[PDB]
Write a protein that binds this ligand. Structure first.
Ligand SMILES: Nc1nc2c(ncn2[C@@H]2O[C@H](COP(=O)(O)OP(=O)(O)O)[C@@H](O)[C@H]2O)c(=O)[nH]1
Ligand SMILES: Nc1nc2c(ncn2[C@@H]2O[C@H](COP(=O)(O)OP(=O)(O)O)[C@@H](O)[C@H]2O)c(=O)[nH]1
Ligand code: ALF
Ligand code: ALF
Ligand SMILES: [K+]
Ligand SMILES: [K+]
Ligand SMILES: [Mg+2]
Ligand SMILES: [Mg+2]
Lengths: 766, 766
C-alpha cells in the first residue's frame, strides 16, 4: 500500500515476456550482441561486393597504383579536417590549389573550361563567386558532381540536367553570405569526374575588389582578403595568379596579395586570362613580353605563365572553349610574335603543370601534419587527462546517456519516498498556507461573539464555502509543487561536495518539459471536497489525545501571530526606555504618538477587557482628546491602525491563557465536574482542520504515488527521448569543456587515421 | 505650496469639477432630462381631478351601488385576505357560496345554474374540478365576463370565449395540482356579469372521494377534505351539497361531513342531480320524496332544491334548464304524485335563497372581523414597541434599500483605505507565502557551496525563474485575497455589539456575487516580472540600517523555521529528562532510537561542523553499527530523516550566528582591506527580497486603487441592481422575521381598510 506504481510495471512487464519472450530474447539481446559483431564481419562482405564493382569503374583493381578514387582519398582527409577545424589554426596547414586574381579577370575560367563551365553559374553582370568553392577533379567518365557532398544522378552532357545543377551551387553560394557583406568564407564542396580532369583540388576563392561600390555591402573587400588568407598564410597552398588581361598589370590587386604570401614565387604560378582583349584594343605585345618574364609581377611566380582565352560567350561548351583556345593561341601575334609558344600557354598544359606541382607539395608536407596532429593529441590528452583524471575516454553521446539513466534513476528514487514524508510535508506545507486565512477570516471574527453556537455555526458555513472553492485547489497546488520540490532535490541537488554540474542544463531542461506535461488529475479536487466536508462535518472529539495534540499546535499558530503582531508593534512604537538608554536610541514622533495612543487603548482594555475589536468613533474621539489633553494630536487613522495590532496582542494573550487553562484546568481531575466558561471551541476548530488536512495529504499522497509520479516518470522518458534525438540541445546542454575536449581528441584521432590513410596511399609507389 | 492645505483643496476642486463634467453625468443629460417634459405632462395629469372622480365612480357606485360598489370589492377583500392568510382561520366572517359533494356530474351544472353561463369545466367519467374556482356574479351588460389577470374580455354568447374560460381554468388547475394527485387548494377567479346573475361569490370545490384508486396518491382524499373543509368549516359560508341522483339516498358521501360542520341546518342545502331518474324509477322515488321532505338527513338542513338538468350536451343553453323545469315536472311523478314542491323545481329559487341569505350573513358577520384585525395589528405593534421601536413597514423594499446603502457606503470606505495599510498587509501576506519557498528551495540548497559567487549565481537564476513562473501569480493572488478580506471586513458583521444581523443575508450574498464576478487585470504579472527582474538586478546596498532590517527579516524567518524543526525533533525523540522525571513521561522506542541517532549525528557534526547536507550510505551503516553496539537497530530512512532535521537545525543555528556577525559587519566594509571572518551574502539576498516585495506590494496597491477596487465597487452596484430586480432573491434574503412582521401589519391594515369600506357600503345598503 506504500507504493503501487512499481508493482504494476513489473506485473505487465513479466506478462509481455510470458507471451513474447520467444521473440524478444532473440531481438533484444542475442541480435544486439551479434549486431555489432556482424557489422565488422558480415557487412564487410556486402560492402566488398559493391566496392569491387565500383573499383572496376575506377579501374583501381585492374591497374596497380592507378585509381580515380585514389584522388578521392585526398579530399576525404580535408573534409574531416574542415569539419574538425575550419579555422585558420588548421586550414592554414592544408595543401590546396587556389584561383587568385582580380574579380573582373574572370579568374575562375581556369577551372570552367575543365569541368565547371557546365555546372557552375558564370557570365558577366555580377560577382558570381560568393564563397570558396572547391572542386575535386579526377580522371574518369562523365559523372554528375557531388553538390555539398550530396549524391546526384544527372547527365552532364544535357542542358536540362546541367541547369538544375547550376541552380544547386548558386543556392549554396548565396546562402553562405550573411547580412553586411556579399562574400562568405563558408566553403562549397564539389567532386566531379570526367575526361580531361586532373587529380587535384582547385578552389575558386571569391574575387578581390579594389573598392566596395554602392552595389556591394561595405565589408566585401575586407572579407575577401580574410578569405584570401587560405593561401596567404598557407605554405602548402599553390596560387594561380590571374592578371585581368583587359587592364595593365600596374592596375592589379593580385600582385600584393600573393607577393606578401611568397615573394619568390615558390608557392605560385602566374596565369593570365582574357589575353584576346589585347587585340580588341590596341595590342602591345612588348608588355606581354614583360608579362611572360614577370618584370611587372612582384610575386615572381614560378613556372610557365599560361594564358586562358575564350570567346566571351557564357554558353560556350568546354569542348568549344578548348578548340577556340588552341586556334587562337597558335596564330595570335600576342603569343606568336613573343616568346609564348602555344603548347605551353594552352590551359591543358597549366592543368597538367598544376597537377604536377600539386603532388609535389602534398607528398612533401603531408607527413608533417601526421606528426603535428599526433603531438597535438598528446598535449591535449596530457592536459585533458590531468584536469579530468576520471574520464580517460569521453564522448558527448556517453555523457548524455549517463545523464539519461541517472535522471531516470533519480525520478524512480523519488518514487521511493515513503508516504510518511509525503503526508507530513503536504500537511505541514498546506496548513501553513491556510493557517492565517482561518485565523484571520474565520476564527477571529467568530471569536467576537460569546455565543459558542454562533461561533461554531459561523465558521462551519465559511469553511464549507471556503472548502468548496479554495481548499482542494490549494491542496493540489501544494502537492504539485511538493513533488517538484523533492524532484528538483533528487534531480540536481549535489551529493555534498561531489556533483556533475555538466548534467544540470539537461536536468532542468528535462524538468521544464516534464512539469509542463505534468497535468495533475483534474478530479482530485472533487474527492477532497467530499473528504473535507466529512472531516469538518464530524466534530466529535471523544479522545483526550486528540485534544492534547490539537491545543499545542493551535498555540504555536497563535504564538506565531502574537510575535508577528508584537514585532510590528515594536516598530510602530519603537524601542522602550530599556533600549533607548541602552543603545542611545529615541522614538520618532509617530512612535511617540503610538506609545501614548497604545497606552490609552491599553487603559481602555485594562477595564473593558471584553471590549469588542470594533471601535466606536466616540472611543476614537475620546482617545484623541485624552492625547490632545497631553499635547498629542492624533489622526483617527493612526488610532485605528494602532488599535488593530494592540487588540490582537490583547486577544491572543487571552486566547493562550484560555488554552493554558483548557489543558491545565481539564487536566486537574477534580475540575472536570466544574462547568466553568472554558468551552475550548477553538481547539475543536483547529483539531478538525488538522485532521482534515491530514486526510487531504493522504489523498494527495495516494494520488501522488499512484498516478502523478508515474506521469512524471513517463514525461521524463518522453522528454529524454526527445533530447536523445535533439542533437542541438544535447550539444547546447553538454558544454562542459571536457566533453568538447574529448570530442576534439576523437576528431584528432580520426584525422590521424585519415592523414595516415592518404599518406599510406602515397607510399603505394614503392 | 509644499504641505499646504490650499493646494490640496484646489486640486481636489479641479478634479471634482472634471468628474462632474465627465461621462458619468454626460450620459444623464441625454437619457433623463429629455423626458422631463413627459414627467411634467404626467404631473399635470396627476394634479387634475378627472382621474380621481372617474375612480370614485368606477370603483364605488357607478349607478349600481349594491351590485357594483361592494360585490367586486367583496371579492377583492377575499382575495387580499387569502393572499395575507393562506389559512381560512381568519375568513370565518366572510361568507361564500360553496358547492361541495361527490364526483357527480351535476356539480358543474348547479354552478352554471347559479352562474347562468356555460363557463365551468364540463366532463364525463372524471372529476374535472381539480381546484377551487371563484366566480363573482352581478348584473351588467348581458353575457359579458372577465378572467382575473388574463387581460381578456369574454363574450358568454359565443363558444370561443366560454371555451377560453374553461381552458384557462383547466390550465390553472393543472398548474395548481402537482404530479401524483388530482386536486389542489389553489384558487382560480372569474368575474361574470349578466341580468340573470345575483350579487353572489361562488367557489367550485373538488368532490369528495374518501378512497384512492388508479395509482393516485393516497393523500388525495385528505387533500380533498381539507380543500372542502376550508369552506365547510366557515361559520358564515353557504354549503351546497351536490348529490348524485342515480343512486339511492342510502349512498351519500358528503352528508356525514356537513352533519358535523353544520348540524343546525344553517348553511347546508342539498340539491338532487339527475332528477330525470326519479321519473324513470332508476333511483328509488320513495327515498327521493323523503329527501325532498328531508326525512333522510341525520342533521338539520338549510333547504333542498332540484337540479333540473339532463344529460344533454355541453352546448345546451340555460333555457334548456327552463325546458326541463317544464317537461320533467309536468310529465314525471315529481308533481303528479307531489313528491316535489314547485319552489324546489325552480333553480332560480335556489339562486335567490343562496344570494339573499348570503348577503344577510355578510351584513351580520363580516363587520366583526375588524376586532381580530385590530387585535393582530395591536399585537404586532406591541412586539415592535417592546423590542423594535425603530421597526416600520420594513417590507421587501425598505430593508433591501437600507442594506444596499450600507453596503455601498462601506464599499466606498474600503475604496478610501490608505495606501499604507494596503502595502503593509500585502507585504506581510506575500512574505508569509514565499518565505519558506525561498528558504527551502533557494537559500538552503545554495548554502551547500562554499563559493559565495556560485551561491549568488544559483540564487539569482532560481529567483529569475520563480519570478517568471510563480512570483507574480502569488503576488496577484495576495492582492486579490487581501482585497477580498478587507471587503468582507467592511461587508460582514463589524466586530462589535451594535450590529443588526438582519442585513447579513444581503451583505453576504452581494459579497459573494461581486467577488465571484470580479476579474483581475490581465497583464499585471508582466509588469511585475519586469519590475522584479530589475529590482533583483539592483544589488547596491549602502546603509547599515537596510543591512540590519534584512538581517532581522531573514533572522525571524530562520527562527520560525528553527522552532518548527525543533518541535518536530522533540516529537521525533520525545521529551528530555527534565519532563520525563517531572510530568512522569517517557520516550517511545522510536523516540529513544531517534534520540540516539541524533546523538551520533551530533558527534559526527562536532568533528565536521561543515559536513554537507548529503549523507553517504557508509555513514548510515556506520551509525547503524554504532547503534547496534548501543543496542539499537534502525532503518536507513530513520537515520536519513533524523539527519535531515538535526542538520537543518544545526545549519539554522550556524546561519543565526552568521547573522549575529553580519550585524557587526557590512557588505562593503567587510571586504575592502580587512581581515573579515564573515563573508556575509544572505543579507544582500534577503534585502533584495524585501525591496522586491515592497515594490510588488506598492504596484499591487496602485493597481488596486486605480482599477480593481472600483471594479469591485461597480460589480457590487450591479449585483445590488440585480437583487433589486430579482424579487425571489430579495424574498429569500429578507426573511428576517421583522420584514415578515411588517408585511403582516401592512396587510392587516389593508384588509382593515377594505373591510371598513365594505361595511360602510353594507350600511349604505340598509
Ligand atoms: N574573352 C574571354 N572571356 C572569358 C575567358 N574566360 C571566361 N570568360 C568569360 O567570362 C564569363 C564567366 O567566366 P568566369 O570564369 O565565371 O569569370 P567570373 O564569372 O567573372 O568569375 C563567361 O561569359 C566567359 O565567356 C577568357 O579566357 N577570355
Ligand atoms: N344526465 C345528467 N347529466 C349531467 C347532469 N349534470 C351534468 N351532466 C353532464 O356531465 C357533465 C358534468 O361536468 P363535470 O366536468 O363532470 O363536472 P365536475 O366533475 O363537477 O367538474 C356535463 O357536461 C353534463 O353534460 C345531470 O344532472 N344529469
Ligand atoms: F567575377 Al568573380 F569570382 F572572378 F565573381
Ligand atoms: F366531478 Al367533481 F368536483 F369534478 F364532483
Ligand atoms: K566578372
Ligand atoms: K363528474
Ligand atoms: Mg566566378
Ligand atoms: Mg367538479
Amino acid at each position: 500500500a506504500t507504493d503501487r506504481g512499481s508493482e504494476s510495471d513489473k506485473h505487465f512487464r513479466k506478462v509481455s515476456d510470458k507471451e513474447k519472450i520467444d521473440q524478444l530474447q532473440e531481438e533484444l539481446l542475442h541480435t544486439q550482441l551479434k549486431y555489432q559483431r556482424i557489422l565488422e564481419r558480415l557487412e564487410k562482405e556486402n560492402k566488398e561486393l559493391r566496392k569491387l564493382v565500383l573499383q572496376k569503374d575506377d579501374k583501381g583493381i585492374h591497374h596497380r597504383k592507378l585509381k580515380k578514387s585514389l584522388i578521392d582519398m585526398y579530399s576525404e582527409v580535408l573534409d574531416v579536417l574542415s569539419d574538425y577545424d575550419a579555422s585558420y589554426n588548421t586550414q592554414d596547414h592544408l595543401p590546396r590549389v587556389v584561383v587568385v586574381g582580380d574579380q573582373s579577370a574572370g579568374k575562375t575560367s581556369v577551372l570552367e573550361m575543365i569541368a565547371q563551365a557546365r555546372i557552375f553559374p558564370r557570365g558577366s553582370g555580377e560577382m558570381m563567386t560568393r564563397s570558396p568553392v572547391k572542386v575535386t577533379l579526377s580522371e574518369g567518365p562523365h559523372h554528375v558532381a557531388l553538390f555539398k557532398d550530396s549524391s546526384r544522378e544527372f547527365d552532364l552532357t544535357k542542358e536540362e540536367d546541367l541547369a538544375a545543377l547550376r541552380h544547386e551551387i548558386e543556392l549554396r553560394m548565396r546562402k553562405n553570405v550573411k547580412e553586411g557583406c556579399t562574400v562568405s568564407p563558408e566553403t562549397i564542396s564539389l567532386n566531379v569526374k570526367g575526361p580531361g580532369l586532373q587529380r587535384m583540388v582547385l578552389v575558386d576563392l571569391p574575387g578581390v575588389i579594389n573598392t566596395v561600390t554602392s552595389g556591394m555591402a561595405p565589408d566585401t573587400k575586407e572579407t575577401i582578403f580574410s578569405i584570401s588568407k587560405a593561401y596567404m598564410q598557407n605554405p602548402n597552398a599553390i596560387i594561380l595568379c590571374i592578371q585581368d588581361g583587359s587592364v595593365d598589370a600596374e592596375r592589379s590587386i593580385v600582385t600584393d596579395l600573393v607577393s606578401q604570401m611568397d615573394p619568390h614565387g615558390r608557392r605560385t604560378i602566374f596565369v593570365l586570362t582574357k589575353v584576346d582583349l589585347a587585340e580588341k584594343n590596341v595590342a602591345s605585345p612588348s608588355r606581354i613580353q614583360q608579362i611572360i618574364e614577370g618584370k611587372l609581377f612582384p610575386m615572381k611566380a614560378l613556372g610557365y605563365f599560361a594564358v586562358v582565352t575564350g570567346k566571351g560567350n557564357s554558353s560556350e561548351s568546354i569542348e568549344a572553349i578548348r578548340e577556340y583556345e588552341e586556334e587562337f593561341f597558335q596564330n595570335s601575334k600576342l603569343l606568336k610574335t613573343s616568346m609564348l609558344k602555344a603548347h605551353q600557354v594552352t590551359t591543358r598544359n597549366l592543368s597538367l603543370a598544376v597537377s604536377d606541382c600539386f603532388w609535389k607539395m602534398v607528398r612533401e608536407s603531408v607527413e608533417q601534419q601526421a606528426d603535428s596532429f599526433k603531438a597535438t593529441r598528446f598535449n591535449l590528452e596530457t592536459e585533458w587527462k590531468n584536469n579530468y583524471p576520471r574520464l580517460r575516454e569521453l564522448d558527448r553521446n556517453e555523457l548524455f546517456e549517463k545523464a539519461k539513466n541517472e535522471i531516470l534513476d533519480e525520478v524512480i528514487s523519488l518514487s521511493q519516498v515513503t508516504p510518511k514524508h509525503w503526508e507530513e510535508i503536504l500537511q505541514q506545507s498546506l496548513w501553513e498556507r491556510v493557517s492565517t486565512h482561518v485565523i484571520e477570516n474565520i476564527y477571529l471574527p467568530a471569536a467576537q461573539t460569546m455565543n459558542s453556537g454562533t461561533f461554531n455555526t459561523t465558521v462551519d458555513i465559511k469553511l464549507k464555502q471556503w472548502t468548496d472553492k479554495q481548499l482542494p485547489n490549494k491542496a493540489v497546488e501544494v502537492a504539485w509543487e511538493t513533488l517538484q520540490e523533492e524532484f528538483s532535490r533528487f534531480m540536481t541537488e549535489p551529493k555534498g561536495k561531489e556533483h556533475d554540474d555538466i548534467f544540470d542544463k539537461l536536468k532542468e531542461a528535462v524538468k521544464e518539459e516534464s512539469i509542463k506535461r505534468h497535468k495533475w488529475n483534474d478530479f482530485a479536487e472533487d474527492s477532497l471536497r467530499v473528504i473535507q466536508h466529512n472531516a469538518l462535518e464530524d466534530r466529535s472529539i471523544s479522545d483526550k489525545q486528540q485534544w492534547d495534540a490539537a491545543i499545542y499546535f493551535m498555540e504555536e499558530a497563535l504564538q506565531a501571530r502574537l510575535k508577528d503582531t508584537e514585532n510590528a508593534i515594536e516598530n510602530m512604537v519603537g524601542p522602550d526606555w530599556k533600549k533607548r538608554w541602552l543603545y542611545w536610541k529615541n522614538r520618532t514622533q509617530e512612535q511617540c504618538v503610538h506609545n501614548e495612543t497604545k497606552n490609552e487603548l491599553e487603559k481602555m482594555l485594562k477595564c473593558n477587557e471584553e471590549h469588542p475589536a470594533y471601535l466606536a468613533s466616540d472611543e476614537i474621539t475620546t482617545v484623541r482628546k485624552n492625547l490632545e489633553s497631553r499635547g498629542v494630536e492624533v489622526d483617527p487613522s493612526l488610532i485605528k491602525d494602532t488599535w488593530h495590532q494592540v487588540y490582537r496582542r490583547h486577544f491572543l494573550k487571552t486566547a493562550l491563557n484560555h488554552c493554558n487553562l483548557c489543558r491545565r484546568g481539564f487536566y486537574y481531575y477534580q475540575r472536570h465536574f466544574v462547568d466553568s466558561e472554558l468551552e475550548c471551541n477553538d481547539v475543536v476548530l483547529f483539531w478538525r482542520i488538522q485532521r482534515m488536512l491530514a486526510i487531504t495529504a493522504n489523498t494527495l499522497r495516494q494520488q501522488l504515488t499512484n498516478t502523478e509520479v508515474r506521469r512524471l516518470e513517463k514525461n521524463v522518458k518522453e522528454v529524454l527521448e526527445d533530447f536523445a534525438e535533439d542533437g542541438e540541445k544535447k550539444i547546447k546542454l553538454l558544454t562542459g569543456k571536457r566533453v568538447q575536449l574529448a570530442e576534439d581528441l576523437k576528431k584528432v584521432r580520426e584525422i590521424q587515421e585519415k592523414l595516415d590513410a592518404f599518406i599510406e596511399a602515397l607510399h603505394q609507389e614503392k
